[PDB]
Design a protein around this nucleic acid. Sequence first.
DNA 1: GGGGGAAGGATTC
DNA 2: CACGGAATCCTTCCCCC
Length: 341
Amino acid sequence: MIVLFVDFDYFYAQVEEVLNPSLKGKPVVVCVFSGRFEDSGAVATANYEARKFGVKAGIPIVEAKKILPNAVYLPMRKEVYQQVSSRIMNLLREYSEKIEIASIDEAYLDISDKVRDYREAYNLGLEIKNKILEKEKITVTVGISKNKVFAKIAADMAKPNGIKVIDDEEVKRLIRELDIADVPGIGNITAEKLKKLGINKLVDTLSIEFDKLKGMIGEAKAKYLISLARDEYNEPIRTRVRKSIGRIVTMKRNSRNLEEIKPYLFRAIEESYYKLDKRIPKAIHVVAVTEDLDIVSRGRTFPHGISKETAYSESVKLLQKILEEDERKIRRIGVRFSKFI
DNA sequence: GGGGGAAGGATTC
DNA sequence: CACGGAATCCTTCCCCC
Ligand SMILES: Nc1nc2c(ncn2[C@H]2C[C@H](O)[C@@H](COP(=O)(O)OP(=O)(O)OP(=O)(O)O)O2)c(=O)[nH]1
Ligand SMILES: [Mg+2]
Ligand SMILES: [Mg+2]
Ligand SMILES: [Mg+2]
Ligand SMILES: [Mg+2]
């Protein structure tokens, strides 16, 4: 099997550059403004200029301003990035029917048939990069290997505007050389847990009682890491299906007052239902972020689909359940729909 | 004992 | 000072054959 993974470079920012070359060369930071005051919120992403000085997805916008007071700060326009992405995705289908869009800017393609070896794959990669750049003016990085995981790692190593192939030889080397923290699906929480166990590399998972591993990080994550190291990981490329549609917003100020929270909640329901399109959900969860940035939720699954009126009333109930069951003020409130008919 | 959900949370990206 | 959207996974609990 030969997998070719593609990931758009600093995507949201670069889309902004495409729509405004004047920005190119300058540091760009796409932000998600919350409105609790101004310049409150987080950074969705930033071009590489800006990342050099530490401005990156996740950090508070105020930190960014601090480090780069004169970089350009643009509000995130997701609809636009989505439509550009959808276009690029269609373009990618033309290289394989077997395609897995894993995020708004990445996909894994199974080109085992289309190509005969890594030499051609690399050429198919170039073809793809050029096609995308040519057609959409978007640069992307490509990763190619025997399975999705290593394809992803390949592109991570070649970022930005790169393309890399990790052959069976290199896969054997990485299993022994790659810091397990650089392995997809392993965040800072599982990373540290792996160290308390002495594991710093994939191979290390082969020198510990499964039951112990299964103990520390759960069976799923254990079998995942083990199969990878056993060079036996082989998950296929499959079309992913939306299972949840929701929305969540930040309130101007914290609160435990229902009438003060409702307009935010209802706003989130309207937007969610719009996104539902013609999908009918049988489940709904109200999600709340408390003052201490903790996340709490309460939901319910109906035997039938949920109408907007029903979601309106049921959501207030679930919110009341939250407020009655949690003494903390609420910072962010949202709703999520799932289990579509 | 174990199937079959469901609910609430945790981790990752 | 920290948004937002979703998937997957884990634990707990309940109904009952
Ligand atoms: N709002 C928000 N959006 C994010 C976050 N992380 C990623 N995104 C969005 C915007 C990113 O451009 C896009 C693609 O993520 P990547 O993981 O591909 O980062 P990006 O493409 O920006 O840079 P890259 O070349 O992949 O290293 O997804 C986040 O933490 N918050
Ligand atoms: Mg990217
Ligand atoms: Mg990506
Ligand atoms: Mg990782
Ligand atoms: Mg918690």
